[PDB]
Amino acid sequence: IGDEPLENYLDTEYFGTIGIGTPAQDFTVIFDTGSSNLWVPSVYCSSLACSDHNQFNPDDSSTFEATSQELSITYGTGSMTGILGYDTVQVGGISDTNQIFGLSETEPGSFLYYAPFDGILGLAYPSISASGATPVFDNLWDQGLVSQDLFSVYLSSNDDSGSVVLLGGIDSSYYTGSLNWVPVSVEGYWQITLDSITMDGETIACSGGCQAIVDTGTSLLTGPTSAIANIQSDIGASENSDGEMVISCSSIDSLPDIVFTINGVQYPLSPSAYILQDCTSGFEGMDVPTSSGELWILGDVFIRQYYTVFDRANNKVGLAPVA
Numbered sequence: 001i002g003d004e005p006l007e008n009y010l011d012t013e014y015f016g017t018i019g020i021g022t023p024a025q026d027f028t029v030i031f032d033t034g035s036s037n038l039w040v041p042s043v044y045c046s047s048l049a050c051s052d053h054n055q056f057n058p059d060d061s062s063t064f065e066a067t068s069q070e071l072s073i074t075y076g077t078g079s080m081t082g083i084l085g086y087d088t089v090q091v092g093g094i095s096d097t098n099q100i101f102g103l104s105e106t107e108p109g110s111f112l113y114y115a116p117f118d119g120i121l122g123l124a125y126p127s128i129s130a131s132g133a134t135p136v137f138d139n140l141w142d143q144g145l146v147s148q149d150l151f152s153v154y155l156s157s158n159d160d161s162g163s164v165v166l167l168g169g170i171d172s173s174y175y176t177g178s179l180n181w182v183p184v185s186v187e188g189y190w191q192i193t194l195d196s197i198t199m200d201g202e203t204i205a206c207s208g209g210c211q212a213i214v215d216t217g218t219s220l221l222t223g224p225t226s227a228i229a230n231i232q233s234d235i236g237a238s239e240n241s242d243g244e245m246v247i248s249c250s251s252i253d254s255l256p257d258i259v260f261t262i263n264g265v266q267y268p269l270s271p272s273a274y275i276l277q278d279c280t281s282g283f284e285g286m287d288v289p290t291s292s293g294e295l296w297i298l299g300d301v302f303i304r305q306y307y308t309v310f311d312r313a314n315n316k317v318g319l320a321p322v323a
């Protein structure tokens with residue numbers, strides 16, 4: 001069983017350290033349940049974002065094996081191109097030998113330049129991995145490096161220490177109640193069916209069901225712009241001159257929970273969770289069209305409230321309230 005600590009960066013990004021190569025070269029990577037590729041910047045990249053992050057040097061690793069396979073990924077924000085290679089990845093105390101990963105050759109755009117993390121370690125299904133690159137957790141399981149084909153994620157609140165990805169294990173010290181299991185609706189992302197979103201017993205969005213993904217790599221709770229617009233109005237958030245969805249901090253103590261019904265079970269978010277305070281809305285409009293319909297994204301705003309188990313043995317997501 002492997003424990004990967006995550007840094008909680010301003011309740012917005014959760015990344016941990018990995019080592020690649022022999023001897024290990026260290027990188028910070030987002031542990032991203034909304035994608036499936038592992039990649040880090042490399043010495044082959046001249047993009048600005050590569051220049052201000054750690055760059056992998058295959059020349060200094062005695063276990064690196066080159067390939068001729070190219071890689072390209074487009075994220076919601078950010079993108080990269082590169083080349084695939086094999087090396088040993090140290091993650092969560094596990095020696096992930098023979099791991100294919102992307103060595104970046106381009107990383108355009110400001111987002112990756114200003115981001116504190118070097119790269120991305122995707123934790124979703126192989127079917128959405130660019131160039132069919134074996135995801136890290138698939139390689140761990142293939143090699144028998146975890147005994148149970150699952151991992152769990154605890155994301156801390158209030159910029160606290162303690163966030164972890166637990167590879168091959170479930171730890172009930174991080175939750176209370178009993179885990180409820182949600183079947184994966186479409187294997188790709190960790191995609192599930194949402195039944196409804198309610199507030200004070202009234203349906204405010206997702207009437208008749210909607211598709212959502214559970215995504216550690218997304219900070220906010222996002223949905224189709226139309227539905228989110230109604231939600232913002234429902235809670236009293238309005239856009240600023242600066243484009244910020246401003247909300248009165250007084251409403252944290254007066255507003256009711258917003259309740260997500262998933263596989264028939266109610267998962268409330270208190271206003272303390274869906275209002276960010278330092279006050280702005282934890283909801284964001286973002287349109288994600290797919291074969292299954294527009295995807296909602298249950299990002300860190302949601303996951304901070306529910307210890308989440310990602311079970312590849314039976315293709316289910318488990319949820320329970322955080323301790």
Ligand SMILES: CC(C)CN(C[C@@H](O)[C@H](Cc1ccccc1)NC(=O)O[C@H]1CCOC1)S(=O)(=O)c1ccc(N)cc1
Nearest residue numbers: 030032033034035074075076077128215217218219288
């Ligand atoms: C660390 C990155 C990866 C963060 N992204 C989250 C990832 O989980 C992201 C979620 C997503 C899925 C499908 C459509 C759109 C977005 N996956 C993603 O695009 O996967 C790629 C490869 C497979 O299919 C598409 S983000 O959305 O770019 C993002 C960027 C900046 C902010 N402030 C918030 C979110």
